[PDB]
Amino acid sequence: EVPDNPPNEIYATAQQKLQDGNWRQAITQLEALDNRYPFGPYSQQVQLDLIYAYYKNADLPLAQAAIDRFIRLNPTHPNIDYVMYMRGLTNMALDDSALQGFFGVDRSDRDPQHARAAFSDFSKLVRGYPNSQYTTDATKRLVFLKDRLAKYEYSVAEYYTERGAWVAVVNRVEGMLRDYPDTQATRDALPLMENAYRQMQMNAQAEKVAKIIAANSS
Amino acid sequence: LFNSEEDVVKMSPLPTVENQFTPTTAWSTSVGSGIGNFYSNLHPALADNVVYAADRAGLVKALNADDGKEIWSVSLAEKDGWFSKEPALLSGGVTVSGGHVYIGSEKAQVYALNTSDGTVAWQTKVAGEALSRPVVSDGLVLIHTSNGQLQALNEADGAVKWTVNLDMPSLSLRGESAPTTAFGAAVVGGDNGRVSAVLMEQGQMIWQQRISQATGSTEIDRLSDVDTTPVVVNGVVFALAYNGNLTALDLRSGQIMWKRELGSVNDFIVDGNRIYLVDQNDRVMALTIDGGVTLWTQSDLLHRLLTSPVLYNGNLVVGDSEGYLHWINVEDGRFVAQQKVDSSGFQTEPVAADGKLLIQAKDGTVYSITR
Amino acid sequence: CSSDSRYKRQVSGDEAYLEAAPLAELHAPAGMILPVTSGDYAIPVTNGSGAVGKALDIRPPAQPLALVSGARTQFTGDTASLLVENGRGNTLWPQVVSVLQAKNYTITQRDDAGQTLTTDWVQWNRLDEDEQYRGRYQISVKPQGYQQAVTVKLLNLEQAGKPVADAASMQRYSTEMMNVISAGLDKSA
Amino acid sequence: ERVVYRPDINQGNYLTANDVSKIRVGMTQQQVAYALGTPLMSDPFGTNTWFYVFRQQPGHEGVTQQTLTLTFNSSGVLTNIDNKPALS
Amino acid sequence: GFVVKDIHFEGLQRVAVGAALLSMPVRTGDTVNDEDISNTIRALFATGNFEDVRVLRDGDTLLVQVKERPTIASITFSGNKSVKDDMLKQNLEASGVRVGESLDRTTIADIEKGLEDFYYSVGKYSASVKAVVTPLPRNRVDLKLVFQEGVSAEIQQINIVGNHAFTTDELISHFQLRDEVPWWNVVGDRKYQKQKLAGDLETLRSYYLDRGYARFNIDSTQVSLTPDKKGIYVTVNITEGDQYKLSGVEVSGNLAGHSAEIEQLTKIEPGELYNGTKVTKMEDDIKKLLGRYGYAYPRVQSMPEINDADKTVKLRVNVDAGNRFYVRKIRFEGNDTSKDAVLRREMRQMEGAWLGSDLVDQGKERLNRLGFFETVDTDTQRVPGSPDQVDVVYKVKERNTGSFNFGIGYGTESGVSFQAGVQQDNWLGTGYAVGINGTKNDYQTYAELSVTNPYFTVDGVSLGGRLFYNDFQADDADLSDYTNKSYGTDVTLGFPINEYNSLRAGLGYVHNSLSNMQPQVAMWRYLYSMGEHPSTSDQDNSFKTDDFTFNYGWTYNKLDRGYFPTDGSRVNLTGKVTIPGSDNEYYKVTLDTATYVPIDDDHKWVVLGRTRWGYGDGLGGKEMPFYENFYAGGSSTVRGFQSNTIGPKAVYFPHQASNYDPDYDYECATQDGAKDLCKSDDAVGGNAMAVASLEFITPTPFISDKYANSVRTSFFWDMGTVWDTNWDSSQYSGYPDYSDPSNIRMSAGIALQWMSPLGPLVFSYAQPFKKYDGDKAEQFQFNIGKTW
Amino acid sequence: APQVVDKVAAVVNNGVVLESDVDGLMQSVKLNAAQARQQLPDDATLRHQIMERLIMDQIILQMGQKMGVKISDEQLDQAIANIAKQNNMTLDQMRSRLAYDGLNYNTYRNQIRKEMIISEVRNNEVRRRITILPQEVESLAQQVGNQNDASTELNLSHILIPLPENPTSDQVNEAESQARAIVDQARNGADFGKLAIAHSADQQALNGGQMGWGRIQELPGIFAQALSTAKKGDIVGPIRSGVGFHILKVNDLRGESKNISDAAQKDRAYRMLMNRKFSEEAASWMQEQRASAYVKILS
């Protein structure tokens, strides 16, 4: 698949295939460069292009591995903000689905692990590099991921309200108030907390939650 | 699964020789199943023109040296049927002395059969598998068990007179070193590569000295086993270790005199001012005693698993794994003759005494070679 | 199977996150407090402005190759610098000039005394862009310690007859000119 | 009318007459937590109050609940004990 | 003494000129002698990056010629057969040799030896290794390691010294390491592994302690090689001691008020033999009992007080329950598709409640029984900085719960034709069970939809609905041929009554309309029972019936899993009875059974007993409609027979067909050539049915564990019979007695199941060694979807 | 045209020999030969032995570096006594080094450091290899009796034809033929010194193999039995001792009937026993190191 031409010609072919838009042959060429010439005038450029091509080709695990190795090998690289942005993007990408999205399914009830990891990476990027070129999109993605996590917690609290586990409902809504205070899911969950307090005949706490709802729903 | 996927081709071919004489088989007699495929020390014993032979399960047999006719036979395999008929797992080789026939066993038993008819005068339990050849001297029978313990059974009644511990490595070569009489002492080898000397009275250690280079990386490269019999001559001890050095040591002080990268687990011969040796690669060699200089070497039998050499009629004799007996001139490596004796291989040492050469094949057939 | 020219330089997503509702704080009623926030999911207020969604170019930042023997190559805002070694000396400037003459670029200014030059316009035939960029460049060679060093800078970039000053585009087409220079120097050697 | 299997919904933390009899006013929060265990429920709206709720809903047999409210002061010293052994 | 005007480097490929210059004693300055050049060369080599270094002078210019140590382009392991490339590759990487790294030729021998060492660790002591260095164009090299693997070392003997209570053969029979391999055990070997000797020694210790030997001790163990190193000897020196009896077990410590039950767990028959595994099981049982009450982390340690003089052992068990743990959160990981509530509603452990662990295991087995996940695991993690709380995390791997069926029949020969169907058990991770089926031809149309919500109420009440449509009328009605048009709806509601039992009740409606039926004994008998009096000499007739039915059912399910179960039994009873008001009256009931019994502790070898029963009949003077009849045979009931072929066969009265083709392709009772009642091979089914099957499930021999969960192989023996209870044997004495149930068909063969991307696929080859005249045989059968 | 200034002549265990070392010893040996009147052979045969001596020197130097052995300035001050022959010619400066290298200081000082370090590590390793037995000392002392028997003192020239520790028979007969040919040439009238410079693996080859004046008992025994029967100038055939074939020439001899009057004879006998043991163990260990070490001559 990969001939034995010097690194210059392999890199030229890889760049040509990336510009054309074919990720698989370009992936082959950059992998050949990385494995055969791990040092030289092309190093790190090959790894950045590998990350980009893995992301665009939906090879998310390989993109994560490449990003991890690049981060742990070149922490001082000037373009490490791009690497962290790509880490956030590939973690958010692992949080999506095709068929469910096609059918308009709300996926906030599913596993939030990848959303949590993406939030962590994007927060790292934004705090470490405020002036980066990707900071605005990173902030928008953080606002979305925060809303998603609050919605997951709301789904769990709603289920436990249905089941009749009032301590679990109160704890879940308290965790929402302590973690995602400013999300819409928290505003929707507060009535669940008030109902859970009342069902356990803790009227003083239901009164406090009702005061909060009256003071803010307006 | 697949029987056609594993094989290593590292065996020398049968050399062509012009025999200066015609080897002959005076007589042959079957002795049980024999050693078999198992690695053992069992071999005949010559005493007062009587040939004593044994078997892995045990078929102790006495045969005439002149015509292999037998005078008495016995079986030591569950004579009283304590449990079915279990094999005795004899592997000590026949020892003969004072009208007694001593044999070891891998069940940690030592038998001391009688000469007149085979009656078991005594049987003693020992510290472990009695792999070593029993050594009779000073009224004691020395055994060297597989778990690294030198015991000295009493000759008369088999009571353990004393015991000595020897270090045992995590891995070693099957077999044990037979002590030497020396002068009121016992010079023995060990699987750890340290030659030791112990007084005959009790187990007071006299000296110990390392013989193996053992500069390896893993266990298989540190196989320093001294499985040969140290040879005492004029107050110097000759020892030979596997993947180690052929060294000479002071009998009492224990300091080495000279060393040579030569290893083997087959007993060597010290005759006059010469040392006949068979290395671990089946390379017959001749050295001198004062210093190691390889007087001559032969490699035509290389990697043909050979038995220990024996000096017979002024020439060296060695068996091979295919049943061929080879004669070698002492002065030079040229083969003096060659013969086919048995289809089953020869593993255990030949016996050369009283102008008679005997061998035992893996199948248990005792052969006498003449002329 | 089916594909579009813009699948490149685009986010592998639906861009739905731009429609997420904004976050609003909760007011604490009188006589009580709201639970203390953990601060684990706090979003700092950054005032920066930048491209979002499909308008953000995620193509990897083009880093100078530094083909000819060198180190500590860099890409500035609108300029790029490459440090060379191996005893080039004053001979560096002729080679650079020859390299840019091999590209038959429209060199407008040639000040050999100052080791400087400037061109009118060069175009790039990239399969990656939906519209081809073009830029005006100035190249020079100056002494540093033991040896000379080359520098390439862009006066401006243009698309479809109008100027553009995006940082990513400037970086990309300065690494482009720097790679051109380095490849020419390596070929000459 | 509701003839379908429903599992037991246990909620809160286990309370025993001995444990509830071990706590007394003046106890610090560490001692109370040692005697009764970590509470699964506290007051997050600006008070040092611990709620020990003991719910048991074996099925369709009817729910029972014992709630023990412990009000501490700013220093962490137990100030008031309110034990309700049954629902209203 | 000369001024260095310039320094020029030649041959540098990997080392940057800057690094080399930093590695130089020279600074392009001046005041340089010959010795300075020599020291420069020595320093460059001391860096360890160069194989050859040279310095030349060209006037006032310094030309440095360096031959960098060539770079490894590729490493090819050729000839290795037992050690796999990835393993050996990792070992060589660990040794410091990898593609791109400069090849220090002063160590090739070393790495060769290292490889041999690894083979030694593999049990191949007489193995040889050689390195071949092939020069490439860009001063790179390919390092091909040629391997000559030696003959493996085999165990010639395993010896135990000091054993008098048990013979050596019995003791070593339980060992993994084996001296002799039975002639019939072709898959066995005499290979020696250190980890196995360690486990065999532990096995011997357990055997001796389990037969009563508190003082058993292994003095030592020896492993030896034959000089040629192709044989291995193992010796174990042991000390039996003597047999001991139990005097009593007394428990002490903080029992947390559970002394009565713990003491009931520690019961011994006075004077019984000591037993180590029994003591371990008592410890484990006490731990489990404490865990049931929330004591997740107790300390239970048993020490035996031995009495050598009396030779009796008294066990002292110290128990400290500790704190009662509470659950803080229950988290689910890996449910990328399944909705969170789908997993959470199977939990028996509430989130904010005291721990019991029995409930956690119950939730785990509920999730496994669900069938939506390939693997389910549980992890109880202590909350950091909390002495009384834990988090329960369930990690799941999702399956392909759907299955697809597709095909095309006659094609474009007559109009168009196709067949399709989909069945999902976790539609879009919502937990809904959805299913669509359809077929189109010029001779038939069929449609069917089914949607079930397993949790219509939080407690588990399920609500399901079904629609179906079926037609046999030809397009444009070319001629009055046999036609059967039906449709109907069915609504069902189910609810649990135990952890394993559930009931179902529902209402169904079905409309049927047959016309131009061929006169035959069974159908005409049923029609007469209905009161109809159709003609027998001609094929023109019609019949229409609306039916309302009450459906009931009961399912017991305690299977190990929802797919490829290895334990447990499942029973499913279904039935329907017509509501008074229907055009015809009858009742019907069916009963399916499937039991799994494992034979191996790993559940690899299983025995499956499957069964199916069915009976139906009329209530008044009516009879069960012939379109509700039972059918047997096929990949679902009795493999080796054509689908729906077992059972009574149609008997036709002489008559004239509505059409007369010149091909003579008409039933035997056609009026043209026949004038007497004649039989046929057309299966019509019966109102009574009984099927059974016994399967032995074995591990697939030629697949690794990575696919073990995906493939199942079994050997089956099937029996089955169908009969018509109302067959008037008094008449029709010249034809087989279809009312006799003794005509039992049997088959035996091999079946393979694969969880393919299109759902389950089942292949089977069956010989029907017992069959009766008229039965159609089909040895090789292929099917898609859940079978039975 | 470009002129080569320096290059690597040999690669050894992580070390290199430079062409400025081969040339230095070439000039040294040429100067000694010219002063000694002993003509020396063609560039290449002299080059092979010099390269061998440099390989052995580099090996020993790297062993010293590995083992943490270093040399003091006072050691250089002492070596100035004999290495520079200041006792014979009364001048301190490097102007005595008129032959080559332009009277430079650093070069000859480093050369002396190289010799001291080699000698030190050689002595340490050989001494740590020696085993002395009281019985042998008693035997040799009782041999040192009857008017100091064998008081013969000899100045000899030695040639060693090397063989590996584990040689093949092919190599054995090759070495045998070589040794017999050298012996035949020496006995037929060929100058032994010229033969020694051309044909010898010993360290003393570059010096022509001269061992200097010694006492017969100091011989490792391998030579004394044959050597007791020999006149001035005789050639002794090939022998063996583990390291290869040995050839000896009797350059000179001098005997006297002096007797030292045991109390003071035991110490002297121990001294001579140590001398022989050091000579033999030194040869054995230098042969072992040569076989073991990594080397790749460069051309």
Side-chain angles (χ1 to χ4, degrees), chain B residues 5 53 84 98 106 111 114 166 203 213 226 236 245 274 334 345:
Chain B
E5 304 306 294
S84 185
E106 271 163 57
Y111 311 85
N114 268 323
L166 304 169
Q213 59 207 27
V226 176
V236 54
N245 302 130
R274 304 273 231 79
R334 94 187 178 85

Side-chain angles (χ1 to χ4, degrees), chain E residues 52 163 191 205 254 343 355 385 503 599 636 694 721 754:
Chain E
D52 185 330
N163 64 317
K191 305 291 188 288
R205 213 177 298 93
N254 181 41
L343 285 84
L355 183 79
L503 303 176
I599 279 139
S636 302
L694 178 146
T721 172
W754 176 43

Side-chain angles (χ1 to χ4, degrees), chain A residues 137-187:
Chain A
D137 199 69
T139 273
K140 302 280 277 185
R141 291 176 182 267
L142 286 177
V143 169
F144 165 83
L145 288 157
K146 203 188 188 181
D147 204 334
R148 162 149 166 162
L149 298 168
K151 284 206 286 181
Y152 176 87
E153 294 299 320
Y154 174 88
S155 291
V156 179
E158 184 175 76
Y159 164 76
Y160 275 127
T161 297
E162 203 179 12
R163 175 74 276 179
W166 305 126
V167 177
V169 173
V170 171
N171 284 355
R172 284 281 170 169
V173 182
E174 193 216 288
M176 288 180 76
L177 279 163
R178 162 195 279 91
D179 285 330
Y180 328 94
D182 45 19
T183 60
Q184 179 61 38
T186 304
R187 285 192 168 64

